[PDB]
Amino acid sequence: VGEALEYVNIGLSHFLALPLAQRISLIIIIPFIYNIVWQLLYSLRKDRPPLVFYWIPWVGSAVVYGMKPYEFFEECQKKYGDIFSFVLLGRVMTVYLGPKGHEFVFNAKLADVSAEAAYAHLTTPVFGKGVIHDCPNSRLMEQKKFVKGALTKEAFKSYVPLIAEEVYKYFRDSKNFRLNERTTGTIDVMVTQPEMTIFTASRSLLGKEMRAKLDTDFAYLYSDLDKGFTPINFVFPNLPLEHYRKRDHAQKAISGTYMSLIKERRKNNDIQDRDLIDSLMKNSTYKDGVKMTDQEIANLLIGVLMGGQHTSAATSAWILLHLAERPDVQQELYEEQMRVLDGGKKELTYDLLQEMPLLNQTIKETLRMHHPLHSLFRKVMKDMHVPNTSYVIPAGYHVLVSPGYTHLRDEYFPNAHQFNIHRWNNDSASSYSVGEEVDYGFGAISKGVSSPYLPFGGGRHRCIGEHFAYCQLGVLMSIFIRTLKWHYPEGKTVPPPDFTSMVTLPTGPAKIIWEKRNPEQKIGGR
Numbered sequence: 001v002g003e004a005l006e007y008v009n010i011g012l013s014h015f016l017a018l019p020l021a022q023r024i025s026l027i028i029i030i031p032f033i034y035n036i037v038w039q040l041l042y043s044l045r046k047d048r049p050p051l052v053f054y055w056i057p058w059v060g061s062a063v064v065y066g067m068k069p070y071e072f073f074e075e076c077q078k079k080y081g082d083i084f085s086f087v088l089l090g091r092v093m094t095v096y097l098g099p100k101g102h103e104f105v106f107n108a109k110l111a112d113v114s115a116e117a118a119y120a121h122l123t124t125p126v127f128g129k130g131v132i133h134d135c136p137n138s139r140l141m142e143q144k145k146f147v148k149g150a151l152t153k154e155a156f157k158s159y160v161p162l163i164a165e166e167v168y169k170y171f172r173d174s175k176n177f178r179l180n181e182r183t184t185g186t187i188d189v190m191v192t193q194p195e196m197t198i199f200t201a202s203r204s205l206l207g208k209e210m211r212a213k214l215d216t217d218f219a220y221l222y223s224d225l226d227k228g229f230t231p232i233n234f235v236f237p238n239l240p241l242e243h244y245r246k247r248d249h250a251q252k253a254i255s256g257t258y259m260s261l262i263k264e265r266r267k268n269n270d271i272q273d274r275d276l277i278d279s280l281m282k283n284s285t286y287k288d289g290v291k292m293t294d295q296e297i298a299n300l301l302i303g304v305l306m307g308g309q310h311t312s313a314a315t316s317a318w319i320l321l322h323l324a325e326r327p328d329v330q331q332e333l334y335e336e337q338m339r340v341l342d343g344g345k346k347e348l349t350y351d352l353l354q355e356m357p358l359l360n361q362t363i364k365e366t367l368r369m370h371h372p373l374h375s376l377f378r379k380v381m382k383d384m385h386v387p388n389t390s391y392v393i394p395a396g397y398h399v400l401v402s403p404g405y406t407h408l409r410d411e412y413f414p415n416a417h418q419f420n421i422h423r424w425n426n427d428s429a430s431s432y433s434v435g436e437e438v439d440y441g442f443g444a445i446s447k448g449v450s451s452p453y454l455p456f457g458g459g460r461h462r463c464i465g466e467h468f469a470y471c472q473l474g475v476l477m478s479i480f481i482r483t484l485k486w487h488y489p490e491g492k493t494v495p496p497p498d499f500t501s502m503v504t505l506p507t508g509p510a511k512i513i514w515e516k517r518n519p520e521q522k523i524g525g526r
Ligand code: HEM
Pocket: 115, 140, 144, 304, 305, 307, 308, 309, 311, 312, 315, 367, 372, 373, 376, 377, 454, 455, 456, 457, 458, 460, 461, 462, 463, 464, 465, 466, 468, 469
């Protein structure tokens, strides 16, 4: 064996004297071979979930997961069951499908998994430092608490007429509508809904000043920042191109604008209860006494607005698209509007929104069919034993949960690919905890996360924008319904989702044709 060891050194030597044709080829095919051999040895382990076979090292199943994750999950489920792993751009993802998966991932102990470790590079380059994913979990919990303080019933009461006003103003002024001059038109909903969403959300959450900013070239900065919000950040968060420079500069200029308003308000003591900015100026002190800086407040505002932007705009787009081939549902919704608002003589309020179950069921059904986040990740921090299995998920892995997948399973939602708002009759709430509850720092929420329907997630990372989303989408759809009818161009139908973008927005261009219900109706104001 001493003689064997000599030939090892000889072999190492002879390698380095190989022609580069053969040892680019060498250093290529020997990972390819080792990978296959490694998977074969891996598949024999009884303490690991089955691993989806893949040919290309590092890359893994990235391409099929990236383009059609649900079809990917369905195939893996048929073959392997509800628990399985797959390689994705250098990381091993352990998927757990179904309610048991919801429970395993969303209710995982703080010591076991980390969301911020999974998402920091996705969001921090976009929002700025010190907030959301660029901070400890208990900091995040309180930031969520701070923001929730601006999201009260009384706040929604004041938001509704503000949001309504922005919708009507958009109908009046936008080149996409111009209702005082046009009775019919064609629109790309991936153009109109992001614009309507930023106008309505800015006006209510940021306030008059920041909304006024959107009527200038300052609006261009929001687009630049929006482009940095991309899956590519998972691999290339910072790359010396101008996509990144436009992003970084936008983040600085936008937070600078918020900070200017913040410092301005404090200078003049002008701090009431107008908006989320007022709210955070009065309520952003952590439990240990440390106060958020003006930069961190601005950075939080960016993240919250940006996140709400994408989820809400995608959702109202899908609502329009599903209703476009369903004049029956438009008809039902309109009748509800006529009854609840007394033929339109009653002004829309937050309370009246609560008396519109079909409208809210329509939102609920859209979120079932189109969960804007098709996958949620956590990085595994401590080895996790999978209950009632021999499986152990080692630290360094990632767990993946997908409530959106379950939303589309017939076993939980019969005829899951049919849009049917009536499957939610006497269950028109946005969601509802109906068992024991728990507080992670931002308010009591559902302890159990086993519901097959989880558009807003669960556990410590649960959404806090749920009621704002329903308020915003509710006011907007209420006005769309009362003002317009709409349908598809001949031969067109609901498009497939684009699963490669940050949220599962519709494939473009997604066009609908609108017409005024009352051609002679005029929208007043300047
Ligand atoms: C239809 C609209 C929306 C949907 C479907 C949605 C969905 C979700 C989901 C599934 C999560 C859980 C994330 C995870 O577990 O990793 C989440 C978290 C969160 N969302 Fe939303 N969201 C929506 C709108 C909004 C809005 C409008 C806001 C703010 C006004 C918002 C702010 C947040 C915040 C602060 C978190 C917590 C992040 C964390 O704790 O890690 N969302 N959202």
